[PDB]
Design a protein around this ligand. Sequence first.
Ligand SMILES: CC(C)CN(C[C@@H](O)[C@H](Cc1ccccc1)NC(=O)O[C@H]1CCOC1)S(=O)(=O)c1ccc(N)cc1
Lengths: 99, 99
Amino acid sequence: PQITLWKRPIITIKIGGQLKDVLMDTGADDTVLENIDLPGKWKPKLIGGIGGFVKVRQYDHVPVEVAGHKVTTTVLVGPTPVDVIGRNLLTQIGATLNF
Amino acid sequence: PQITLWKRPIITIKIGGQLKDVLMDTGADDTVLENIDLPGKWKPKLIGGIGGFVKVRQYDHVPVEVAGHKVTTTVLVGPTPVDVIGRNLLTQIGATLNF
Ligand SMILES: CC(C)CN(C[C@@H](O)[C@H](Cc1ccccc1)NC(=O)O[C@H]1CCOC1)S(=O)(=O)c1ccc(N)cc1
């Protein structure tokens, strides 16, 4: 699809078997959600946001389905006001910003 | 133009007689810039992100030029570590996401 930006660009994806509404965020290097149930171990990651740097959990090789594509990707879990999918995943689905 | 997202989409904008490099950010509701002195009255606003709330000044009808288009736009000014243009300005220049 070609999405205009008058509204927030929210899509529904599947992650670790659960449907989650996520904001498509070109200004985010990474994909981060608050308090989703993902199995297995993780490693600490420090990410920078507008308010400073925040520690999150990093989960690798997570199966996700986005706009019809089934991929595995890195997913961060931590105290974000918005669940976002960032360029790491947007690149996996071939997304572009056009103007 | 069509921009893939493997790189951060950084464009220059002219504003307040200066040239600034800004991230084209579909995740930001509104443009926010750190180091800039804009003239006239403004209203205080809080914006929410990773790392909590950030206090900004909202300036309205600011002349800017971006991607070759001159418009007036809302600009938030406050201590972001990364300057971004948000959906308010991306819509003024007809930017879309495509996947
Ligand atoms: C939905 C969110 C997170 C909104 N922000 C936009 C995001 O694009 C934000 C842009 C940014 C990049 C680098 C450092 C600082 C900020 N990236 C971000 O946090 O990336 C993290 C999360 C995962 O990857 C890394 S915002 O900056 O809080 C914001 C909020 C309101 C306005 N009007 C403008 C900006």
